[PDB]
Design a protein around this ligand. Structure first.
Ligand SMILES: [Zn+2]
Ligand SMILES: [Zn+2]
Ligand SMILES: [Zn+2]
Ligand SMILES: [Zn+2]
Lengths: 263, 71
């Protein structure tokens, strides 16, 4: 179990008796591998035309991401929404089909640990509609480092309706790959995060893809404690109570603090 | 290349209505979205041009790839 769970102050919630029970988290990724004896995947769907099994993860990232959500929120219910194939890529339309599935099946949180440097009007429409319907929508900010003074935040994280999550190491320092820009909302651990992998394995991965599910899991913790808070309120609590790491272009509001976010 | 998403103005909610517009311009419907006022389709360049100019259509954009942000 990874360093990141303590770093975001998730244990305070666990101690109070809030572990994410009855909160449905959709992991929009490459599937979630059934090789794990405890992810408690409650269902799912695939929108990758040539890979119809959402419980087979031929990439590894979906399973790792799911595991981080659960580390954070151990009683949450995960849904495997396979919108990326084995090579880790997916068409805009497959992702939109994933988002729409999550809306139709009343998911509480969407995690999207995926990006592209340019956007799609239809994908903006999908995330916007999800947030409109009350879903907390979280995405990895991107792994494009710096490019002068320009934003390198990827889409869909770059859309206003979506929480954009950058990556810090265990010392709270921004990872050199972490995207930058005014669109960054918060940071979470994303360097050598240990989590579940295919083939019943367990190992480290790095990226804003590992940071995002810390936030998705935090949202699940908050909603288990506070079922009456709206998505807007969950999002504001995470952003407004973050530990400032000084410097919004690089860190947004700073490091999430689930203990502070939840009252 | 050739995979696109065709977005629609008001009054084209059912998949049948979207599909008919895409079909009339020589495109091949792939999927109609439920909430988003759009559909994926495969289109040659003439179909893209004709759909873009069709009063029913809000936009035609590439169905571009997004990727896992993990190493
Ligand atoms: Zn704990
Ligand atoms: Zn396991
Ligand atoms: Zn955003
Ligand atoms: Zn409450």
């Amino acid at each position: 179990v990874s360093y990141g769970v303590a770093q975001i102050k998730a244990p305070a919630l666990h101690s109070q008796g809030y572990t994410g029970s009855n909160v449905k988290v959709a992991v929009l990724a490459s599937g979630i591998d059934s090789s794990h004896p405890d992810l408690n995947v409650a269902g799912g769907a695939s929108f990758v035309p040539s890979e119809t099994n959402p419980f087979q993860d031929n990439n590894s990232h979906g399973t790792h991401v799911a595991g981080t959500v659960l580390a954070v929120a151990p009683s949450a219910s995960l849904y495997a929404v396979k919108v990326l194939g084995a090579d880790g890529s997916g068409q805009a339309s497959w992702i939109i089909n994933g988002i729409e599935w999550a809306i139709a099946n009343n998911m509480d949180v969407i995690n999207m640990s995926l990006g592209s440097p340019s956007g799609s009007a239809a994908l903006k429409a999908a995330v916007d509609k999800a947030v409109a319907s009350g879903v907390v929508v979280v995405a990895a900010a991107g792994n494009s480092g710096t490019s002068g003074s320009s934003s390198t935040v990827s889409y869909p994280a770059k859309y206003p309706s979506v929480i954009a999550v950058g990556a810090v190491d265990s010392s709270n320092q921004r990872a050199p790959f972490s995207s930058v820009g005014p669109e960054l909302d918060v940071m979470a651990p994303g360097v050598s995060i240990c989590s579940t992998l295919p083939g019943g394995k367990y190992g480290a991965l790095s990226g804003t893809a590992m940071a995002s599910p810390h936030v998705a899991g935090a949202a699940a913790l908050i909603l288990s404690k506070h079922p009456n808070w709206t998505n807007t309120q969950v999002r504001s609590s995470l952003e407004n109570t973050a530990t400032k790491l000084g410097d919004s272009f690089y860190y947004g509001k700073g490091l999430i603090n689930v203990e502070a976010a939840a009252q | 290349e050739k995979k696109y998403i065709v977005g629609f103005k008001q009054g084209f909610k059912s998949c049948a209505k979207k599909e008919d517009v895409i079909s009339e311009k020589g495109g091949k419907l792939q999927k109609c979205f439920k909430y988003v006022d759009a559909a994926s389709a495969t289109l040659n360049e003439k179909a893209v041009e004709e759909l873009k100019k069709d009063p029913s259509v809000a936009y035609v954009e590439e169905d571009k790839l997004y990727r896992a942000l993990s190493a």
